[PDB]
Amino acid sequence: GTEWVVTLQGADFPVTIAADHDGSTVSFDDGSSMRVTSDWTPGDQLANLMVDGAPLVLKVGKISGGFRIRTRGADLKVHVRTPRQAELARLMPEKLPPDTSKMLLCPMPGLIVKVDVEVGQEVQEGQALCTIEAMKMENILRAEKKGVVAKINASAGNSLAVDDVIMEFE
Amino acid sequence: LEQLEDRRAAARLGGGQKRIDAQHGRGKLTARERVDLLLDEGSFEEFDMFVTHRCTDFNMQDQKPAGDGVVTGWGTINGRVVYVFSQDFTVLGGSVSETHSKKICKIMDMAMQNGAPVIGINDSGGARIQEGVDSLAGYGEVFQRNIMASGVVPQISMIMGPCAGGAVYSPAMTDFIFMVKDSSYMFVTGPDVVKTVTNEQVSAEELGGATTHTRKSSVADAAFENDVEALAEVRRLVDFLPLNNREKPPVRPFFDDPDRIEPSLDTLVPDNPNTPYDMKELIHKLADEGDFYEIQEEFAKNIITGFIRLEGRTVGVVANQPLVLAGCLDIDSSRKAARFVRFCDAFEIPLLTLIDVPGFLPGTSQEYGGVIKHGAKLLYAYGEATVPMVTVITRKAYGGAYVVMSSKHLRADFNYAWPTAEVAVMGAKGATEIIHRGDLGDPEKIAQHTADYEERFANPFVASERGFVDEVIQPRSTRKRVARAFASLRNKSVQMPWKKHDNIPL
Amino acid sequence: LEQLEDRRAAARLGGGQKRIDAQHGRGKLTARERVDLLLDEGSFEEFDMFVTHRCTDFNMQDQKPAGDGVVTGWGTINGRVVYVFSQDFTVLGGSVSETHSKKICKIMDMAMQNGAPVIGINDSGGARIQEGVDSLAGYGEVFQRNIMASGVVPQISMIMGPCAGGAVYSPAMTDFIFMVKDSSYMFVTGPDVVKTVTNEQVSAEELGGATTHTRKSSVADAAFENDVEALAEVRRLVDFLPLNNREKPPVRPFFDDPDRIEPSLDTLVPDNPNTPYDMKELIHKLADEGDFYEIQEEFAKNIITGFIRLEGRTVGVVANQPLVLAGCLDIDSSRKAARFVRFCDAFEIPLLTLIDVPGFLPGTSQEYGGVIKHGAKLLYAYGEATVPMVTVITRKAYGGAYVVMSSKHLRADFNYAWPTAEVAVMGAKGATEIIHRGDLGDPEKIAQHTADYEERFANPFVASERGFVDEVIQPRSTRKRVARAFASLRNKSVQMPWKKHDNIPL
Amino acid sequence: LEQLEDRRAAARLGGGQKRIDAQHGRGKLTARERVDLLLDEGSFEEFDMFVTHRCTDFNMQDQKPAGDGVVTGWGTINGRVVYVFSQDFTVLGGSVSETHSKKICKIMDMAMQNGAPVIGINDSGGARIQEGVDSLAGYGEVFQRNIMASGVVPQISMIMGPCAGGAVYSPAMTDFIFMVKDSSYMFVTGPDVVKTVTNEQVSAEELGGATTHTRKSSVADAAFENDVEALAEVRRLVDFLPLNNREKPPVRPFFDDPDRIEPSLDTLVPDNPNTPYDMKELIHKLADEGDFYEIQEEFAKNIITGFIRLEGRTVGVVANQPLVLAGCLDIDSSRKAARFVRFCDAFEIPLLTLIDVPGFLPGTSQEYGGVIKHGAKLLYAYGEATVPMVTVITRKAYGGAYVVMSSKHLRADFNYAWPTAEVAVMGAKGATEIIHRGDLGDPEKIAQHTADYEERFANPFVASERGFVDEVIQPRSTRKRVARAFASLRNKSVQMPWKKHDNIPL
Ligand SMILES: *C(=O)CCCC[C@@H]1SC[C@@H]2NC(=O)N[C@@H]21
Ligand SMILES: *C(=O)CCCC[C@@H]1SC[C@@H]2NC(=O)N[C@@H]21
Ligand SMILES: *C(=O)CCCC[C@@H]1SC[C@@H]2NC(=O)N[C@@H]21
Secondary structure, rough: EEEEEEEOOOOEEEEEEEEOOOOEEEOOOOOOOOEEEEOOOOOOOOOEEEOOOOEEEEEEEEEEEEEEEOOOOOOOEEEEEEEHHHHOOOOOOOOOOOOOEEEEEEEOEEEEEEEEEOOEEOOOOOEEEEEEOOOOOOEEEEEOOOOEEEEOOOOOOOOEEEEEEEEEOO | OOHHHHHHHHOOOOOHHHHHHHHHHHOOOHHHHHHHHHHOOOOOOEEEEOOOOOOOOOHHOOOOOOOOEEEEEEEOOOOOEEEEEEEOOOOOOEOOOOOHHHHHHHHHHHHHOOOEEEEEEOOOOOOHHOOOOHHHHHHHHHHHHHOOOOOOOOOOEEEOOOOEEEHHHHHHHHEEEEEEOOOOOEEOOHHHHHHHHHHHOOOHHHHHEHHHHHHOOOOOEEEEEOOHHHHHHHHHHHHOOOOOEEEOEOOOOOOOOOOOHHHHHOOOOOOOOOOOOOHHHEEEHHHOOOOEEEEEEOOOOEEEEEEEEEEEEEEEEEOOOOOHHHOOOHHHHHHHHHHHHHHHHHHOOOOOEEEOOOOEEOOHHHOOHHHHHHHHHHHHHHHHHOOEEEEEEEEEEEEHHHHOOOOHHHHEEEEEEEEEEHEEEHOHHHHHHHHHHOOOOOOOOOHHHHHHHHHHOOOOOOHHHHOOOOOEHHHHHHHHHHHHHHHOOOOOOOOOOOOOOOOOOO | HHHHHHHHHHHOOOOOHHHHHHHHHOOOOOHHHHHHHHHOOOOOOOOOOOOOOOOOOHHHHOOOOOOEEEEEEEEEEEEEEEEEEEEEEOHHOEEOOHHHHHHHHHHHHHHHHHHHHHHHHOOOOOOHHHHHHHHHHHHHHHHHHHHHHHOOOOEEEEEOOOHHHHHHHHHHOEEEEEEOOOOOOEOOEEEEEEEHHHHHOOHHHHHEEEEHHHHHHOOOHHHEEOOOHHHHHHHHHHHEEEEEEEEOOOOOOOOOOOOOHHHHHHOOOOOOOOOOOOOOHHHHHHHHOOOOOOEEEOOOOEEEEEEEEOEEEEEEEEEEEEHHHHEOOOOHHHHHHHHHHHHHOOOOOOEEEEEEEOOOOOOHHHHHHHHHHHHHHHHHHHHHOOOEEEEEEEEEEHHHHHHHHHHHHHOOOOEEEEOOOOOOOOOHHHHHHHHHHOOOOOOHHHHHHHHHHHHHHHOOOOHHHHHHOOOEOOOHHHHHHHHHHHHOOOOOOOOOOOOOOOOOOO | HHHHHHHHHHHHHOOOHHHHHHHOOOOOHHHHHHHHOOOOOOOOEEEEEOOOOOOOOHHHHHOOOOOOEEEEEEEEEEEEEEEEEEOOOOHHHOOOOOOHHHHHHHHHHHHHHHHHOOEEEOOOOOOOOHOOOOHHHHHHHHHHHHOOOOOOOOOEEEOOOEEHHHHHHHHHHHEEEEEEEEOOEEOOOHHHHHHHHOOOOOHHHHHHHHHHHHHHHHHOOOEEOHHHHHHHHHHHHHHHOOOOOOOOOEEOOOOOOOOOOHHHHHHHHOOOOOOOOOOHHHHHOOOOOOEEEEOOOOOOOOOOEEEEEEEEEEEEEEEOOOOOOHEEEEEHHHHHHHHHHHHHOOOOEEEEEEEEEEOOOOHHHHHHHHHHHHHHHHHHHHHHHHEEEEEEEEEEEEEEHHHHOOOOOOOOOOOEEEOOEEEEEEHHHHHHHHHOOOOOOOHHHHHHHHHHHHHHHHHHHHHHHHHOEEEOOOHHHHHHHHHHHOOOOOOOOOOOOOOOOOOOOO
């Protein structure tokens, strides 16, 4: 196709493409048109382009409907869909993350090798909490969401089965 | 005749605009809209559009909608022919009747005579009760076809609504089952009967929701965020697959180099053996443009199975995950990979097996659960497999598991090893306790006996002396090693003994 | 030379007379005595009697017994060639080495090149640790062979001692696994490791003893009282089996009549539908001389699988047991029958399927356990099977299960029915609640709506009008009907589409 | 249930006792009575006895008889399995519906899967109009089946009532068509339409009666006196035929000697060349117990096609009849033998060809009629045939015809000749007028030139010098020569080039 709809920072850009050998010419609704030129090719994690003569360096990643682009402090999913794709995608429900328990349950029946968090400490989403030793293999358990340690009830050398609450969060 | 145009447009309406909204309300696309996003823009040809059911019981004949609940036909995905059927939930709940199945059978029979995949989009309330045994027979004909086409033409199942009762058994037999995160579900018996019989009360989503199946039951291969990505991701899959069991995996351009070196790899296996590492890093760096379409990601996480391309050709990959259960092999991980292996084989897709398994997971749970049978399945798979098999052992390869992970004894082609590999009967410790009994009461003898076994056997070199490891390579060069290894195997041709079929443990 | 006679006699002594006593002490016979009772009196030819291992580590070379732990060779069972190996526990514990395997491989390779079954008598301590990876490799070659012969020549496994570790996987892949009531056991991981890793304490017999496996794990097919009957029963089994996948089931004289009538059958189905009856009664009366060799009797008891003969020819049988779980199909019953069917088909043995199933067993346990996949297996099995298939529905045939039990939609040849048969989408009750919603608040409407569905659909006649039941027969004549039905199918020949192999769910 | 017995007996009544009489009134037996005499006493197993049609138009659903117009199933003829369907004229005229055909397909599909002939007993008023296209589709599935089985399993059609419209095309494609002297008939279009479109007035019997077809159209293979002999002669026929294209002609005891001599034969060829003789005398004397089952006796009488046995094995025979058209080959004689040859070959039945043809029958009628194409058919048949081919030229073998009649150039195996044989380019007369033009004005030159061609070329010896006649034998020994000739060819195996199918002229 030639017609696409680029969906950025919550903004839709119905666009048309025409390309030959040199580069490509993207045209927007308002009649304006940019000229993209690039070395890029699938797989390249970094893209050095030349849009409207001015350098544009991006960090690329694959995503179902396009890619994850990162320019300045920017970092956003850029969906490149076709008009009917886009049209329908708009009928798709808005995903709401799962719920989190404020209780860190032990998922592997092993031995607690170390706890690197104190009571009343504040933790970042995904931060290393403790470390259970499985079968001569270390497993690092981490904060689900940012929160603050209510109470701990296990320490080095401890040996807990599944579900045993390791820590509690307020 | 613009009359034709009318009939056509009428049919396209399904159970009506009011029901279409209903559907959309559930965040669910319509049968037709799903077909629309699946197939190459304007390439869909529909069949049996005005088909009506033949029921006369329960005044069923007063409601004879066109299409009878399912949209069937063909089209292409990136120019390649594909057969499809999307159940239309808005028409009699997309309930299975004699004629609904018949429509599905026509394109299945067509997919088989022409050697092209079949994509099934299930979104049905279940059997059409009023049809009596006719609904059952309808299922039968689909089932039979599903069976005859197993390993003959790819059968990808897409569950995008409800799938209950006998129905579940069809997707069951297809090669893949994808579900849509929250709007879909499947189970043989409904939540209400589970209550009346088990006194247990549970919601459809709890009983057989996308999540329950993508990580507890072992039934689904992935749960997509919604209808749109689900359809997008399925084409992505189809792009890797061969069109049938005669041709080999498809080829396409690739902007990567078979001689790419990843020095980073040289330090992926941590020095401390109790410290994991993510096996997936390796996969990505080996995989072509770093693209890895994983299968059953959220289940049996102690093992990874997926698709990648090398020099633009599809290569299946089975690998151990140290991050979970310490890369152990267990009933579930076995069942998970075993099937993946067999599918790849049946369809001439090569296998790359990345190894780091300690042994199988201990437990009464496992033994009483039948690891003796399930565990065997993965072994059976590699034994049986005849596509090209390349293997790279990154660290641990001990005993039985060592053998099962595409060992040279299962007739794999290339058996590579990282210097950090350790192939042996069992760990130095336990090995020592068996070999040296009268020496335990001397904690320095056994402490030394182990220190020797370790120094003398925990490595890839004794295996090398034997020929079991064709070579020990520098980690950075793995992509280069493996790519050409397969390259040379493109012509591979090996014969298994004649038989109606196998008897693999169930 | 009488020197030869000496060496010979020498070898025959195994780990020596003191150990031979030890063995006998555990009520266990010796490798050689087991062989002796298995093969036709004096028909055993032994091979590699003086083979010695090639180990040099751990002073292993100072103990080079003859035979190296296993007795291999060939002989006959009722005059028919059979290949065998009996592990000699008294010799290095019958531990598996490079050379022990090799010995087993020799007769496996020979069984395949000549189309004769292989009887494996396992009674080993496990791998020969001192051999390092050579012990692993040894297992490999056995496995590979086990795999290649699957469904090509029968592989009957006899466990008469311990079977630990990788080893379990071989019998795992053979077509049958029989164990000896108390002197045998098998598990992937040892009870002691189960402790140090699960902190669970359990005895070998508890972990993987004959009972645990013939009843809980789904691994063994039967537990024999002792070494002597175990061997007698194995020959019995072999007498039914075909020697390989080329010839068809063996024939032999039979002192019974294909036209025999059992009037008793006419009252086998009880009047009250909540009252069971023993499906096995039927089996016996149909079976030729009333002989029925049951497989996995003590497992998945809600389904029966066995062998019988008709007009002196082998006929495999799958039947529903009302006595247990009310003849329901469930993960286990499914896995149990599924494999039986595939083996019988891979080996040209016809199938007789006796039906009386209500549906599948409801439950969170089942769905979370994956019935969608396991349930399918039996379906897959019948769908794939091409031997002659005859069916007799004695009573219940409802929904999905109805279809799965060798229905006519799976292309069975003869679909017979007793007048007491009831084939329908579901029970009258549930059916009614679905078909007549706006009628529940009137407990007489639904009481009547059900009374009609019951009167109009719960029977075999609607299926008859459709052709799905070739005929409704008088119970007493079943033996007569079925016998000739199979007779006329002796020439059956059906072709499944070409494919490397199937992709059946695992 | 004695309820079953009632339903059963109810069904057995067909269109009722009043119609049964009507039927019997026309000298016609009932569907079931015909089946009863066809199959080995009590060996019939009926299928789909309670099948009912699925029509809803024209109040068709108020008349839902059991069986829906046709009796299907299997049984044996002299112990050999045979599949059958007898149309029940008393039931909705034995009119073809969706379901009536389905029943026929079930046993056609069964005949093919088990390799057994299909005997079709047509006695139908034609399609079931109320069913609309479903009646058309009904025919379709039969036709298709009829086609796939052509030359794979013998298809004997028996017409014992009316057969009109598309219907005729089924028996058309079977291997044999027998009709019952006065009670049967068949034609694509009815006498009444023949009127309204041709203004020609003709009766059904005239249009397509047993006689019209057994001697004018070339459609039937024989007209039997009545229903009873019809049935009896069909089994007789079946006793000669192989059960399918895999096995070879059946064998049975034979009280006759392969070395029998018929001196009477030495004078069968009359001295005067203008006097016929009955080629059939020879056939009977050679035939085993003098038994000769003739095909299409009353048609293309200038040629004979039939079956006989030798040493108790089936042998097909094509031979020229001097008594008619002077044994000329003509469009019809050609079409008549051509197919016989092809059926015999398609089914491994050897051929014995007895020769005495002068050439082809001259005429504008022949040329405009396409002898170029029809004539070739027989040639094509022998050229293609690979079963064993023995030939005996009794007298005349001139030109083209000589070649067509299983000549040695068509790769026949034995090309025997009686001393009275005369193989040559054309007669001495004609030959002479061409070879010697400038000599006609001298009636003594040509009178002498002929006398020389006659004395030098009209015999079997010039052909013998060439090897074209393997040997010239004494007439009395023919039975002996031919019997062992075939005996020695029992192993014959010859390969034709690979191809989907032939393109023989139509
Ligand atoms: C150390 O904590 C004890 C060793 C644990 C045994 C490990 S667990 C998985 C490996 N495979 C196996 O059967 N045992 C090994
Ligand atoms: C009484 O009828 C209570 C309902 C039980 C339903 C039975 S239990 C097993 C059968 N299969 C199934 O899914 N439901 C049936
Ligand atoms: C004698 O009366 C004249 C010769 C007639 C020719 C005969 S008629 C049929 C034979 N075939 C042929 O072409 N010529 C022969």
